[PDB]
Amino acid sequence: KNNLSDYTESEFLEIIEEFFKNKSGLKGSELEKRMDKLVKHFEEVTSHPRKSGVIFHPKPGFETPEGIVKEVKEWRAANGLPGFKAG
Amino acid sequence: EPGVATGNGQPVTGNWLAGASQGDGVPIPSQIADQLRGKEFKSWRDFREQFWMAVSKDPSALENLSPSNRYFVSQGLAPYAVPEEHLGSKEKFEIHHVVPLESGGALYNIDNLVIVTPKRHSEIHKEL
């Protein structure tokens, strides 16, 4: 919740999948404000330099929820940052 | 304030959303205008939702969007621009009126609408 290390990889993947499907069932402005919250939360806990770019402008091969998670995992490992909860 | 959309837009195809980060924005594609022209909208929020949903039915736009941005526009949500075109916490592509209502542009005039990145929008404002 507060940090990335509070997430297991599966739990974090659950959030990322919401950027591809309507998990919440919300529509219109309410859906947008939820996705707004998820985006800024994503940027906050991952501390990734490309921010939401990881999700909305992914590198080739990393366009899927699995790829997004893997990009986060790889970047944080490369920067000596704590990874996901085990596991 | 409810209204009726008018305008023909402008006929260009390809990565039309690439022009959103340049100049004074990219005008609304004609094939997008076709889906909006002659329709009634209860509010601007209503029009904004319908606009992106129309973008979601356009192959020329879809092909140049990530799978994530494709889902968003399919839900009537504004797509996100590249990080390079962000402005702090402002990240979404934005619909903007070229001339404001008091100068005196029309609210639902498609020919008065352009798409801009948050970064380009600030640069436009500075040039005024």
UniProtKB/TrEMBL annotation, chain A:
The keyword Repeat does not apply. CDD domains: Col_Im_like (cd16363). One of its GO terms (biological process) is bacteriocin immunity. It comes from the Bacteria. GO terms for molecular function: toxic substance binding. It holds the Pfam family Colicin_Pyocin. Coiled coil: none annotated. Keywords: Bacteriocin immunity. The keyword tRNA processing does not apply. Belongs to the colicins ColE2/ColE8/ColE9 and pyocins S1/S2 family. This is Small component of pyocin AP41.
UniProtKB/TrEMBL annotation, chain B:
Residues 67-122 form the HNH nuclease domain. It comes from the Bacteria. Belongs to the colicin/pyosin nuclease family. This is Large component of pyocin AP41. It comes from Pseudomonas aeruginosa. The lineage of its organism: Bacteria, Pseudomonadati, Pseudomonadota, Gammaproteobacteria, Pseudomonadales.
